[PDB]
Write a protein that binds this ligand. Sequence first.
Ligand SMILES: NCCCNC(=O)c1c(NC(=O)Cn2nc(C(F)(F)F)c3c2CCCC3)sc2c1CCCC2
Ligand SMILES: N[C@@H](CCC(=O)O)C(=O)O
Ligand SMILES: N[C@@H](CCC(=O)O)C(=O)O
Lengths: 262, 262
Amino acid sequence: GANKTVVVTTILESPYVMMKKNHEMLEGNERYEGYCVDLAAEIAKHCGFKYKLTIVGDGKYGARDADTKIWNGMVGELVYGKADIAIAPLTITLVREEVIDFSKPFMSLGISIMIKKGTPIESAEDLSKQTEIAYGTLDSGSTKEFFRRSKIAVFDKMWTYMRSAEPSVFVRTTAEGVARVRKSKGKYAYLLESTMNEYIEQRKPCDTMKVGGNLDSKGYGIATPKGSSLGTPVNLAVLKLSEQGVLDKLKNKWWYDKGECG
Amino acid sequence: GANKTVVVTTILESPYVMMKKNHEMLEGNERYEGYCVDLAAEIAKHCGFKYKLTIVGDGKYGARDADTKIWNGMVGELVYGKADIAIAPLTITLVREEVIDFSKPFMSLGISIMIKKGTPIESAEDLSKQTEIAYGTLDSGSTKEFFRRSKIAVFDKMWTYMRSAEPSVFVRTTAEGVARVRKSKGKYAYLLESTMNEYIEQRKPCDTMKVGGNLDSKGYGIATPKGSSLGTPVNLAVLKLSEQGVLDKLKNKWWYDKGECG
Ligand SMILES: NCCCNC(=O)c1c(NC(=O)Cn2nc(C(F)(F)F)c3c2CCCC3)sc2c1CCCC2
Ligand SMILES: N[C@@H](CCC(=O)O)C(=O)O
Ligand SMILES: N[C@@H](CCC(=O)O)C(=O)O
């Protein structure tokens, strides 16, 4: 039938999507800025659609409830027909691939360790072999699932600790994880995606550090409801933007051009 | 109908697929070893198919002839129905995505510079601004197309030079490119994927170096004829192998465990 306004689900996660400081003075898509705001504009231009940016109601990435089997977050939005596409730092995983479609990756990342500067930790092995420094992850996302599912001794050991740590080591948002690292005098390390870790390392007050190598290697994809006719042109648009250098240019724009730590 | 033997196209490219030294004494799949030999076995196990490894007839990755519009290499094999799947270091590109299917990436890479040790070159910018050191790429693959298509000043300048350099700076195989770097007393630099570059840097006689950062960021995918029912389970198998750490384990096996330079 007639072209419709494509409803885009995304998440408030810096520097992917952020409220403009003058957002009260603005309407619709103009309220927001960031990497994924720019990316949504590029994808829409190349695929020739009109779109509305919306922030996921529950503020989550997406996980299936073990009891209800219901998906929450942006993944839920797609599965239950509440959004047409997700343009966000949404990690490509086996369990999600079964229920939604993903483009080829538009950005790579791996799980990584964030410490307050001078914390005596170099690696996941270090974290696993001590108790004084607590560590955890975001809940409802791919990092938590990684540890939950891992057969690898060090990661299995970390999971056994985190799942029963008191008080809880899990956080509701990335900004919470960062706030805990900053305020815990080095007694909390935060396990998060290297992309978010590298962005925060370039933000005032420049008191955090990404340490050691990444624990895994993967990517974010643009997601669509399974079988959506949008998936094909969106995937081809991601490949063009990659091959044109536009994705690299957008990463430089939002991570390093505006970087606050020198 | 009945299950059939899946015909796998691949390429002799170290350490992805190599002849076993005792290959004369062996039959069928047992002739070969390498990262992609191991990967093919894993994919086949998880998807439950029997398969025959074959080496692409023309020894190429795949390009479309500007005049005939005919695809050569492994891409051609898939397009014209001569193979059922390609399990090789085959780069995901826009032009290929239009005519074949690709899984999510099983390995990441970017274009990179290989020099003989002590060559006074640090970057693509350095290469572009001098003439004494010749440089080129593999023909019939994604690296050559990258330079051909690039709008980026430095890469555009490199392409203008390479396309008309005499004698020719392009090579038929990776091993040729390496042999030219090694034998040219530092007067030839070779532009190749960081994966191949990093493997050769760990092989005797340890006389080559990867220099500077990568020029782009992308990945290899397992490829199938467009619409093949094989694409779905193969893609899911790649995600499992990624999430299990098996892909990382296979990279360590073939690059670094056996590494010859310390
Ligand atoms: N080391 C274990 C697996 C290695 N993994 C990958 O390379 C890998 C990924 N790699 C990448 O995304 C690298 N990568 N691949 C591409 C692509 F798709 F080839 F064009 C692009 C990028 C980065 C920039 C945009 C274009 S995504 C992903 C995996 C495995 C799990 C699923 C999601
Ligand atoms: N990108 C992750 C969220 C962040 C994290 O889990 O570290 C996801 O899509 O679930
Ligand atoms: N992986 C490349 C070949 C190697 C190169 O072009 O550097 C391709 O699929 O075409």
